[PDB]
Design a protein around this nucleic acid. Structure first.
Ligand SMILES: O=P(O)(O)O[C@H]1[C@H](OP(=O)(O)O)[C@H](OP(=O)(O)O)[C@H](OP(=O)(O)O)[C@@H](OP(=O)(O)O)[C@H]1OP(=O)(O)O
Ligand SMILES: O=P(O)(O)O[C@H]1[C@H](OP(=O)(O)O)[C@H](OP(=O)(O)O)[C@H](OP(=O)(O)O)[C@@H](OP(=O)(O)O)[C@H]1OP(=O)(O)O
Ligand SMILES: [Zn+2]
Ligand SMILES: [Zn+2]
Lengths: 355, 384
RNA sequence: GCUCGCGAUGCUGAGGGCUCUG
RNA sequence: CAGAGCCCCCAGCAUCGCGAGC
């Protein structure tokens, strides 16, 4: 209960954890334009909240530097990187369940009636972003009392343009996408049921009408979702002491951290790789490694989708047929509302193996 | 009035004088300025025939946060920019005047044109005053009073010469356009990308091609040009001639009536003095017929109380719609139909849009950069 | 004459603090 | 709430020198 107290706690917890990871904000990698994070709650408590993930970044990869081997991060906007960090947590929580019977009590996952795994009662995830996400949620005049267009991130800069190959969808559109197909992605949907954010908390440029349109209301025309998939309508809130616009140059790097990690990981938004040119623990390849390790531990009869001898990344995603159908329904709802066609990257980029 | 320097001195004197009348002989708190500008209309040979159309002050552009998706905010409060917008109100009033009755046709500056719609009566000219050199190419390389002992520009073949330049939010310095960076966005500017505004040197060059009336008025009237640009200080003839026209002498394939205008360029006999103190945050505007100046917070693009200027895009669109309803179809210079959306209505000025296109290509072909526009969302509004 | 890098001295819209004032 | 005076601080130009390329 009390939306504004939750909002404040989530905002305070994520900022607090960012401090600890940056020598109380004094490290050069505390330099950020947008801060994001995910907080998990367990029961209608107060302070039984855990920061799951902490991220920064405002920039995307140049085309020259795109990987056809899953070694490069395509999108380093804080909120996108915070989701990917949550995927690392969810793989860890599946290994916790699977590695020892006595650890099943400590995992957020339990066996589901319907097959594979689902969350335990009252396990919720909350998204913090220090500003409203790029795209439709940020197309207004904050000093003033055709909308819902899908938008793409512009090659160089930090903002978006409407649509009608090398192009990334806005954060406003990706969170709307997460409010249909879940936050967990295609590959995790093979082990676990759809997972939604209960709350989206903004640290600035909060606006109830614009954010609700961006996040779900523009696609309430959505049709015939498979079972467990809903149009999720999370709690939307700003925070009590909002953050001021700081006009200037925006940093070139993106920070990420997941609960359990000893240190932040610093990526170059331009290359999608860390400062020494190695692959992130968040890239397609690294998440596919986590997924493959869990696929090795889960008996065939316990999968929510059939998939034996997984090799190519793209094939393994196509096996999540509930998810691919809810994605189709999503792509249709935007078209029929007159809001544009989702830009998908050419699926040679996902044609790689762990060979 | 026929001698370049007398006209130049009269234009300066009239704008100073009018600004004085409006600020209780410079006593009032809104007399405080760093840069003054104005438009004077001559309707013939004698000083009697000189009328001040507009007066403005200001040195500042809007803060990114305060951009209005309804066109209720002034984006650029550089004096010379505000003085042109004040002229636009005069031109709308003068069109409504012609249309009012047959008596009034005689007292309008406009007559029906042989080629459709309206044009100026013979010998109606406009003259722009700025108390200093316009920011960008006319100013950046020598923003100080000229000195006899200083021998003009020693390095006129430098790449930096003639370049399109932007004012940059929170940054001093008028900065070239670069090819690596691209398109400004609404969402980018709100979260803190610095808002870029094209320099006044670049905007007056534009006016010497597409005219001063803008896209909307071009649907009713033929292109209007400044006959003179007069600087009350920091006059440097070689930088100003380059900035105002000579750098895009390469421009081609202009629509009919559009041309590369080469206005008289001049300083004055007794240069204006450096205005003392900190640059005020407000911009003043006045058009002939107004009872008083309007004061705008240039940081917000609105007045002290948050109300829109008589000069904001919404007020100009409102003026255009009112005239649009009194001009019969057969007097339109353009028959192209567009939705009553600010952006869309400007696209009915097909010839103006083609002249803008030629302008942009000429800056690019000359190696002087690509023009930087506001985010496309700015002008996506309607009346109410 | 231009371009690039280095050095030097200068030039030209923000943020912060102190003081006074309305 | 606003304004001013003073200090502090934050991407282009000028001038001169050094090196190189054209
Ligand atoms: O975190 P993101 O940057 O938003 O990454 C997503 C994510 O890809 P990965 O999990 O492999 O990195 C989507 O994967 P799933 O929803 O299938 O789990 C995928 O979408 P599809 O593979 O379903 O097509 C793709 O998006 P897209 O192909 O639509 O461009 C991509 O987004 P980016 O390409 O923008 O990184
Ligand atoms: O130079 P300003 O007086 O500030 O105004 C101009 C003017 O816009 P408005 O009359 O609506 O304010 C131009 O419009 P036109 O009259 O030439 O049609 C427009 O250019 P576009 O029409 O191409 O939209 C735009 O310039 P831009 O979009 O290049 O930024 C803008 O300049 P500002 O944005 O700086 O105010
Ligand atoms: Zn984003
Ligand atoms: Zn200017």
């Amino acid at each position: 209960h009390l939306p504004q107290v939750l909002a404040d706690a989530v905002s305070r917890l994520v900022l607090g954890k960012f401090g600890d990871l940056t020598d109380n904000f004094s490290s050069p990698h505390a330099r950020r334009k947008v801060l994001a994070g995910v907080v998990m709650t367990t029961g209608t408590d107060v302070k039984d909240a855990k920061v799951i993930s902490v991220s920064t970044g405002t920039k995307c990869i140049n085309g020259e530097y795109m990987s056809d081997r899953g070694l490069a991060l395509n999108d380093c906007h804080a909120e996108i990187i915070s989701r990917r960090s949550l995927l690392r947590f969810l793989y860890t929580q599946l290994e916790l369940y699977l590695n020892n019977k006595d650890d099943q009590k400590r995992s957020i996952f339990q066996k589901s009636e319907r097959g594979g795994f689902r969350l335990k009662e009252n396990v919720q995830f909350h998204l913090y972003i220090s500003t409203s996400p790029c795209g439709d949620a940020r197309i207004f005049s904050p000093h003033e009392p055709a909308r819902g267009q899908l938008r793409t991130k512009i090659e160089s800069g930090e903002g978006t343009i409407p649509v009608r190959r090398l192009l990334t969808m806005s954060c406003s559109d990706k969170i709307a996408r997460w409010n249909v197909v879940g936050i967990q992605g295609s590959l995790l949907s093979i082990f676990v049921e759809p997972i939604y954010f209960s709350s989206i908390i903004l640290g600035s440029l909060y606006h109830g009408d614009h954010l609700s349109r961006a996040m779900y209301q523009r696609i309430s025309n959505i049709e015939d979702l498979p079972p467990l998939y809903t149009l999720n309508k999370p709690l939307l809130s700003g925070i009590s002491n909002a953050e001021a616009r700081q006009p200037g140059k925006a940093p070139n790097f993106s920070v990420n951290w997941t609960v359990g990690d000893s240190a932040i990981e610093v990526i170059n938004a331009t290359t999608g790789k860390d400062e020494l040119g190695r692959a992130s623990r968040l890239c397609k390849h690294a998440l596919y490694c986590r997924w493959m390790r869990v696929h090795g531990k889960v008996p065939s009869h316990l999968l929510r989708s059939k998939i034996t001898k997984p090799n190519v990344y793209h094939e393994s995603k196509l096996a999540a047929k509930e998810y691919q159908a809810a994605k189709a329904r999503l792509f249709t709802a935007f078209i029929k509302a007159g809001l544009g066609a989702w830009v998908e990257k050419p699926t040679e980029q996902d044609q790689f193996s762990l060979t």
